Amino acid sequence: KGEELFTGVVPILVELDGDVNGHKFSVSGEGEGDATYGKLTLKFICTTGKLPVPWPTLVTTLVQCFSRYPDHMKQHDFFKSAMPEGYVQEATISFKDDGNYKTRAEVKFEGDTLVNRIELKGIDFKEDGNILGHKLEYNYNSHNVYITADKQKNGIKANFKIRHNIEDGSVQLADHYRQNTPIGDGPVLLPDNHYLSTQSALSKDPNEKRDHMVLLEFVTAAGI
Ligand SMILES: [Mg+2]
Ligand SMILES: [Mg+2]
């Protein structure tokens, strides 16, 4: 049972290689998750210099196995069930009136550590749009991630809309379409329709000179 791997505090590593409109960059993250409380705490560093996109646009790419699934919903937790072999998470993020990100990640244990390894590719972004023009506020709204099964692929799909606040009071929509597929051959849990209720707080480390993001996140399964 992968769920048994999450009863306590688990170290997390995140590594992302990105290319947006030919701007190349990498991000490294470290922290821990405590699924019992649906809680994530991570610090992300742009190891290549200045991040060429706003940090908030990377939040959904940068480990939903740390969601809190209520006891009565535990037979719907696909993410922990795929562990430790892990799962592939792929997404298309469409920024309304702008470019798109396509991502591919593997989330699995490396020893006792939960690792999220990501490749991100962004194209067709506007030079002085909200993303490349860095016009997005350093904050983050609360969302519901709607999950449905894809029995065909032995996995799940997610559909949701991220709303990014813009510095002028407007909103930049990011439509998300994602698929998750197990890496191993063992049985996984295919859930009834439900959603993950997420809340995210972004901050800075006062002693840190590199381009970075400190994130505190709470995720709870619901709708069943
Ligand atoms: Mg490193
Ligand atoms: Mg505002």
Strand partners, 146: 159, 195
Token reading at 87: 């799962």
CA of residue 141 relative to chain centroid, distance: 14
Token reading at 32: 């821990």
DSSP 84: T
Q: Which ligand is nearest to the CA of 166?
A: 2
* Discontinuities after residues in the chain (C–N over 2.5 A): 62
Which structural technique was applied?
A: X-ray
CA of residue 142 to ligand 2 center, whole Å: 14
Separation between Cα atoms, residue 47 and residue 163, nearest integer Å: 27
Separation between Cα atoms, residue 118 and residue 103, nearest integer Å: 7
Separation between Cα atoms, residue 221 and residue 193, nearest integer Å: 11
The span from the first CA to the last CA of the chain, in angstroms, equals: 22
Q: Which ligand is nearest to the CA of 210?
A: 1
Separation between Cα atoms, residue 32 and residue 42, nearest integer Å: 7
Q: How far is CA 193 from CA 19, 49, 148, 186, in A?
A: 34, 41, 5, 22
Resolution (A): 1.7
CA of residue 109 to ligand 2 center, whole Å: 39
- Asked if 201 and 217 count as a contact pair (C-beta separation under 8 A), the reply is yes
What pairing do the DSSP bridges indicate for beta strands 113-123 and 10-20?
A: parallel
Q: Which ligand is nearest to the CA of 137?
A: 2
Token reading at 55: 């940090």
CA of residue 74 to ligand 2 center, whole Å: 37
Class of 1-224 per CATH? mainly beta
Nearest to 41 by CA among 221, 165, 216, 172: 216
DSSP 58: G
Separation between Cα atoms, residue 39 and residue 52, nearest integer Å: 28
**Prior bond to 70 cis, omega within 30?**
no
Residues with CB under 5 Å of ion ligand 1 are: 28
DSSP secondary structure string for all residues of 113-176? EEEEEEEEEEES--TTSTTTTT-B-S----EEEEEEEEGGGTEEEEEEEEEEEBTTS-EEEEEE
Separation between Cα atoms, residue 75 and residue 105, nearest integer Å: 24
Q: Which ligand is nearest to the CA of 169?
A: 2
CA of residue 168 to ligand 2 center, whole Å: 7
CA of residue 6 to ligand 1 center, whole Å: 25
CA of residue 169 to ligand 2 center, whole Å: 4
CA of residue 175 to ligand 2 center, whole Å: 20
